[PDB]
Write a protein that binds this ligand. Structure first.
Ligand code: ZN
Lengths: 142, 100, 192, 142, 76, 59, 65, 62
RNA sequence: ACCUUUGGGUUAAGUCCGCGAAGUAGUGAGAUCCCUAGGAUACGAAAGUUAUCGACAGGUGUUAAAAACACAGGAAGGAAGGGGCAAGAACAGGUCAGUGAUGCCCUUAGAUGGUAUGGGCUGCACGCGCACUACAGUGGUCACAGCAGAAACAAAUAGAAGUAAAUGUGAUCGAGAGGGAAUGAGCACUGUAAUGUGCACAGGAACGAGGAAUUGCUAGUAAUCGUUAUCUCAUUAAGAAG
C-alpha cells in the first residue's frame, strides 16, 4: 500500500479533512481545483504563506487533497490551513526520522501556533430581553 | 440469529440501571457480550412567558423533555429470545424489538 | 503561483531593513511579524498590551471598517489597501511600508489638553501623552481624514489613500491629519 | 477521468456558447428580448444572447453532477441554483427562484437533439453531449 | 458648467502632449482636469492603451490604473 | 475572587495536623493522599484542598 | 364536526354541496380551562400558557438551561 | 518652532483627575541634571521616553 | 426594655485574614446540574459516536497574613465561558378578562345567558411610546459562479410560496437611472364569504443624515447579512424566540 496519513482542522463551524500521500511530484488540490485555478485568493494566500515557513524541500515528493464543509469563506481558509499544516508534521513523524518533525514544528510554532492548534472560539447564545448575546432592548422613563 | 432491542426512556438513571442489568445478563450467558449503543436523545421543547398578565419585565422560560435511548444488537437462538423476553416487563422504560 | 521565495507583503513588498526613526515609539510598532496577508485572528485583545503586538498594516485595515454600514467587511478593506500600496509604491518609489511608518510618526500630537482640578472646579491644563496613546491618535486622524474626503467626490477611494499618506510622511500642510495635529498642539500651548 | 475540472468556468461557458449559436441547437423563447429571468430581477439581461449562456451553463451543471456521481438533476434543483435576492420595498430582501419556462424549453430542445435524456427522477447526459465537451477542452487548454 | 460627451480635435491633440511626463493616471484625472464625463474618459483611456501611448498596470474588478512615459518602478 | 471557603480551609488544616509525615512538597503526592484518606465526593473540591495543603506545606 | 353548506350555480337552479373547513379559535379551546387565548398547539398539546406551567412537572418537562 | 526635550520616566505615583484619566510621574531629562514632576495622560510604563515642550513647567503637588 | 462590643487589610459574597468577654455548631453564598469546547485503551466495519479524564492562582516574579496582576506554557488560566437554581423580612405593587381557585354585592326569558346574519374593534382634527425602509457610488443594473447552521422540495412556455443572503469575477449606469408613498383598467390564489395575499403595466410623495433631550454595549461582544421542518398560521410577520 502507498504511504498515507489523514488529518482534521477546525475553525468556527467549518471542518476540513486532508489526505497526504507519496508522489513523484508535488501536487495540491482544493475543491478539485489546483492553486492556479481556484477562485478565491484569500485561500491561495493563506496556503502559500504556510508553504514558505515550511521549506520547499520538505513538501517535495508529496501530494494533497483537501475537502471541507460548514462555516463560511474566511473561516474555511483557516480550517484548511490547519489541516494542511498538521499533515506534514504527521508524515515526517511516521515515515522519516523524528528530528526533522521537531525542526519543522519549531518553525511553524515560531510563526503561528494557530496553524497547529485549533481556536476554541464559537458564537455565544442569544438570551431573552435583547437582540443578541449581550445587547439589551431600550429602557425608557418618560 | 440477530436481534435489535431498543430501550427507550425519559429518565436517565433507570435506563442506566436496566441496561447495566441486561449487560450483566449478556456477559453471564457469555455469547460474546458487548455494551449498548448510546442514541441521540430526542428533545422536545416549549418557550413561554412567566407572568399570567402583561405586567413587569417580560421574563421567559424554556422547558425541555429528554427521551434517552439505548440499543443492543445481539446474537441469540429463537428459544433464548422467547425465554429472555420474560426480562422485558414491569419497567418504566418502553421496550421494542426488531428481527430478520 | 507568482513566487517560491521568502514572505513578502501582498507577495510583492520586501519586508526587511525597516527603521522606526523615533526612539519614543520603538517598542510599540510591530514591523517584525512576517505575514503574507494582512489578516490574523490571534486573540490578543484579551490582554494588557496585546493590541500593541498586532502588525501595522493590520491595525491600518481595521480602521477602514467604519461609518456603520461597513462593519465586519474586512475583505473589502484588504482590497482597498492593496490598491493604495500599488499607487504609493509607484508615486513615492520607496517600500509603501516606510511611507506608512513615517505617516504615523508625524501625525501623533505630543502635548494635549486635560482637566486636572480635583478638589474644586475642573480647570483645563496642558498634559503630556504616552507613547501608546500617541500612535492610537495617529491612526484615528489618518482614517478620519480619508473617510470624510471621499464622501461625495468623484475620485476613487484607493487614490485618496495615496494622496494623504504621502503628504503625511512628508509632514506637509496638505494632510488633514497633519493640520489637526498642529491645532491640538497649539490649543495645548494656549492652556499651558 | 473528471476532465471538466481542468479549465476555468469563465473561459468554458463563453466557449461553448459560440458552438451552440453557430449550430442553432437551442432556439429562443418567444419574447426573449424583453422577458426577465426571474421575478427577483430588476431588468431584462444586458446580453441579447443570454438564452445561450443559460444553455452553456446548464450543460456545465450536468457535467459536474456526472463527474461527482450525484442523483439526476430536477427542474426544481436548477430553479434554486439560478435564484437570487428579490427587492421588496420597505421590507427585508428575500430569496426567490428562477423562472421554470426558460429551463423547460432548453431541456426539451436538448432532448430533440439527443443531448439530454429524461429519467424517472430527473435529467441526465448522453454520449454526444459528453464528447462535444471532451473535444472542446482538448483544444482549449492547449 | 456641466461635463462633455466629445473629445474634440484640439482637446485630443493636447491630451497626447500632456499624457507623457505624468506617472500614474486614472479615469478621474481626464474628467477633473479636462471637462470629459466618466463615460468618455473610459473610452479615450482604453484607446491610448491600444496605441501603446500609455500602459495598464492594474485592472481588478472595475478599479483600473494606468501609467505614462515617466513612470519608473522600485528595484531589488 | 479565588478564596477557598470555610470547609476547604478547615479540612486542609485538620489533614496536615492528622497525617503530617505522609505529605510532601508535591501536588500529585498530596492529591493521592487526599484521594486515599478523605470522603470528598467531587474532584472539584479535592483539587482545591490539595492546592491549599501544598500552599501550607512550604510555609 | 365537519359542517356542510348548499350553494347554487350561476343558473340559480342547479345545487351543489361544499364542506366548511375547521380553522380558527373555535375548536382549539384549552383542555384544562376552555380558554381561547395563549393555547400551545405544539406536540399535540392543546393547553394554555397559564395551565402549562402548573402541570409541566407532572407531564415531565424541566428547565435544564 | 520645534524645540523639544527628551525625558525618561523613573516612577509613577497616582491616578489623578476627574474620572482618574491622568498619572503623576517622575521624569529625568536625558542631557541635563533636571528631574521634574509631571502629569501624563496615556498609558505609561516605567523606562518610557517622552517628548516635552518645556523643561520647567511643573506639577509641584508630586 | 437592650448590647456582645475599638469598625485594621481582602472578595462577586461577614468571602476571608488579624484582634478580642466571648466561644461552638448551621441556613443564605458557596459548594452542589445541565448544555457548549478537548480526550479511546471502549464500540463498529464503517469512516462516526460516546467518554470517572483534563485547570489548581499550579509555575516564575512580586519580602506579615488573606487575595492579586503580569507573563508562560496549554484544547481550556484566575468565579474556564454561557445559562439554570436561588435567604429572612417586605409592599394595603399586578392580575377576580387564565382557572369547576374564591368571600361579598349586582343581573337573571322583553337576560348582563347562548346562537345566527350583518356592522364595529381597523373611524380621524390632533399629542406620545416602540419598530421597518431610506436618504446612494464603501452605490443601482445584467450575467455567471459559490459557501451555513446541515440534510424533506407534484408538475408549470410571461408571471402568478420555498434549500441562504451578504459575498466572488466580469459587464453595464453616472450624481434624485437613490427612493417606492397615495392611485388606474386589469390577470390569478386562499376562503363559506375578500375587505386579505401574489403578479403584470403604469403612476411616481416626503426624505439630501435629524432641536432640547435620551437608550444599550468589554470579544466571536457590538453592529451588518440572510434563514427559520420555531411560535402565532385557511390565507395573512415589518412581532417575539432561536
Ligand atoms: Zn388553560
Amino acid at each position: 500500500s502507498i504511504a498515507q496519513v489523514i488529518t482534521k482542522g477546525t475553525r468556527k463551524t467549518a471542518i476540513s479533512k486532508c489526505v497526504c500521500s507519496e508522489s513523484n511530484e508535488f501536487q495540491l488540490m482544493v475543491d478539485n481545483m489546483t492553486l492556479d485555478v481556484h477562485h478565491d485568493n484569500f485561500l491561495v494566500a493563506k496556503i502559500k504563506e504556510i508553504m514558505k515557513i515550511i521549506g520547499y524541500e520538505h513538501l517535495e515528493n508529496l501530494k494533497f487533497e483537501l475537502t471541507t464543509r460548514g462555516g463560511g469563506p474566511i473561516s474555511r481558509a483557516y480550517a484548511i490551513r490547519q489541516a494542511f499544516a498538521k499533515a506534514v508534521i504527521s508524515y515526517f513523524g511516521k515515515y522519516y526520522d523524528e528530528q526533522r518533525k521537531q525542526d519543522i514544528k519549531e518553525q511553524i510554532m515560531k510563526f503561528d501556533r494557530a496553524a497547529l492548534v485549533a481556536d476554541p472560539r464559537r458564537v455565544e447564545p442569544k438570551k431573552y430581553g435583547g437582540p443578541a448575546a449581550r445587547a439589551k432592548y431600550t429602557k425608557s422613563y418618560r | 440469529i440477530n436481534v435489535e432491542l431498543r430501550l427507550l426512556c425519559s429518565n436517565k438513571k433507570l435506563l442506566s440501571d436496566l441496561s447495566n442489568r441486561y449487560y450483566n445478563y449478556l456477559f453471564q450467558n457469555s455469547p460474546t457480550a458487548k455494551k449498548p449503543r448510546v442514541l441521540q436523545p430526542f428533545i422536545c421543547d416549549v418557550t413561554t412567558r412567566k407572568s399570567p398578565c402583561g405586567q413587569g419585565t417580560a421574563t421567559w422560560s424554556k422547558y425541555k423533555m429528554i427521551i434517552h435511548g439505548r440499543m443492543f444488537a445481539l446474537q441469540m437462538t429463537h428459544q433464548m429470545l422467547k425465554d429472555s423476553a420474560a426480562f422485558l416487563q414491569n419497567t418504566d422504560v418502553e421496550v421494542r424489538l426488531t428481527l430478520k | 503561483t507568482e513566487t517560491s521565495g521568502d514572505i513578502k507583503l501582498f507577495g510583492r513588498y520586501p519586508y526587511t531593513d525597516l527603521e522606526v526613526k523615533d526612539i519614543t515609539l520603538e517598542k510599540y510598532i510591530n514591523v517584525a511579524s512576517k505575514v503574507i496577508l494582512p489578516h490574523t485572528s490571534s486573540r490578543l485583545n484579551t490582554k494588557k498590551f496585546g493590541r500593541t503586538k498586532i502588525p501595522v498594516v493590520e491595525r491600518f485595515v481595521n480602521a477602514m471598517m467604519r461609518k456603520g454600514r461597513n462593519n465586519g467587511k474586512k475583505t473589502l478593506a484588504m482590497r482597498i489597501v492593496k490598491d493604495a500600496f500599488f499607487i504609493i509604491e509607484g508615486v513615492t518609489g520607496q517600500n509603501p511600508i516606510q511611507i506608512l511608518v513615517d505617516a504615523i510618526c508625524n501625525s501623533g500630537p505630543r502635548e494635549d489638553s486635560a482637566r486636572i482640578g480635583k478638589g474644586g472646579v475642573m480647570k483645563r491644563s496642558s498634559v503630556d501623552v504616552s507613547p501608546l496613546r500617541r500612535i492610537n491618535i495617529a491612526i484615528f486622524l489618518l482614517a478620519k481624514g480619508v473617510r470624510n474626503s471621499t464622501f461625495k467626490d468623484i475620485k476613487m477611494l484607493p487614490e485618496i489613500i495615496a494622496e494623504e499618506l504621502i503628504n503625511a510622511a512628508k509632514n506637509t500642510q496638505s494632510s488633514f491629519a497633519v493640520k489637526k495635529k498642529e491645532e491640538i498642539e497649539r490649543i495645548a500651548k494656549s492652556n499651558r | 477521468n473528471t476532465e471538466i475540472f481542468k479549465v476555468r468556468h469563465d473561459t468554458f461557458i463563453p466557449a461553448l456558447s459560440e458552438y451552440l449559436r453557430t449550430n442553432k441547437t437551442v432556439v429562443p423563447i418567444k419574447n426573449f428580448d424583453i422577458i426577465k429571468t426571474s421575478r427577483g430581477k430588476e431588468t431584462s439581461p444586458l446580453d441579447i444572447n443570454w438564452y445561450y449562456t443559460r444553455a452553456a451553463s446548464i450543460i456545465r451543471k450536468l457535467l459536474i453532477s456526472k463527474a461527482k456521481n450525484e442523483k439526476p438533476l430536477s427542474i426544481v434543483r436548477f430553479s434554486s441554483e439560478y435564484g437570487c435576492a428579490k427587492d421588496r420595498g420597505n421590507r427585508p430582501n428575500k430569496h426567490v427562484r428562477a423562472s421554470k419556462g426558460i429551463i423547460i424549453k432548453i431541456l426539451n430542445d436538448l432532448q430533440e437533439k439527443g443531448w439530454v435524456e429524461k429519467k424517472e427522477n430527473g435529467w441526465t447526459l448522453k454520449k454526444e453531449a459528453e464528447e462535444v465537451s471532451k473535444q472542446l477542452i482538448e483544444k482549449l487548454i492547449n | 458648467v456641466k461635463r462633455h460627451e466629445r473629445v474634440e480635435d484640439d482637446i485630443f491633440n493636447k491630451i497626447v502632449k500632456d499624457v507623457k511626463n505624468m506617472r500614474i493616471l486614472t479615469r478621474t484625472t481626464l474628467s477633473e482636469r479636462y471637462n470629459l464625463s466618466l463615460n468618455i474618459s473610459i473610452k479615450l483611456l482604453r484607446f491610448l492603451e491600444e496605441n501603446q501611448i500609455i500602459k495598464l498596470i492594474s485592472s481588478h474588478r472595475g478599479s483600473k490604473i494606468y501609467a505614462g512615459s515617466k513612470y519608473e518602478p522600485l528595484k531589488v | 475572587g479565588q478564596i477557598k471557603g470555610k470547609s476547604v480551609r478547615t479540612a486542609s488544616k485538620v489533614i496536615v495536623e492528622r497525617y503530617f509525615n505522609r505529605l510532601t512538597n508535591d501536588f500529585y503526592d498530596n492529591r493521592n493522599v487526599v484521594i486515599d484518606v478523605a470522603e470528598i465526593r467531587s474532584k472539584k473540591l479535592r483539587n482545591k484542598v490539595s492546592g491549599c495543603v501544598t500552599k501550607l506545606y512550604k510555609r | 364536526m365537519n359542517k356542510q353548506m348548499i350553494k347554487y350555480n350561476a343558473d340559480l337552479e342547479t345545487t351543489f354541496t361544499v364542506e366548511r373547513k375547521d380553522f380558527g379559535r373555535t375548536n382549539r379551546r384549552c383542555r384544562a380551562c376552555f380558554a381561547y387565548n395563549g393555547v400551545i398547539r405544539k406536540y399535540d398539546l392543546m393547553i394554555c400558557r397559564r395551565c402549562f406551567r402548573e402541570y409541566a412537572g407532572d407531564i415531565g418537562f424541566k428547565i435544564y438551561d | 518652532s520645534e524645540e523639544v526635550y527628551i525625558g525618561e520616566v523613573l516612577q509613577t505615583l497616582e491616578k489623578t483627575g476627574p474620572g482618574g484619566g491622568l498619572t503623576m510621574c517622575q521624569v529625568q531629562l536625558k542631557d541635563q541634571k533636571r528631574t521634574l514632576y509631571r502629569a501624563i495622560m496615556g498609558p505609561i510604563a516605567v523606562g518610557d521616553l517622552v517628548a516635552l515642550l518645556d523643561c520647567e513647567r511643573e506639577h509641584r503637588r508630586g
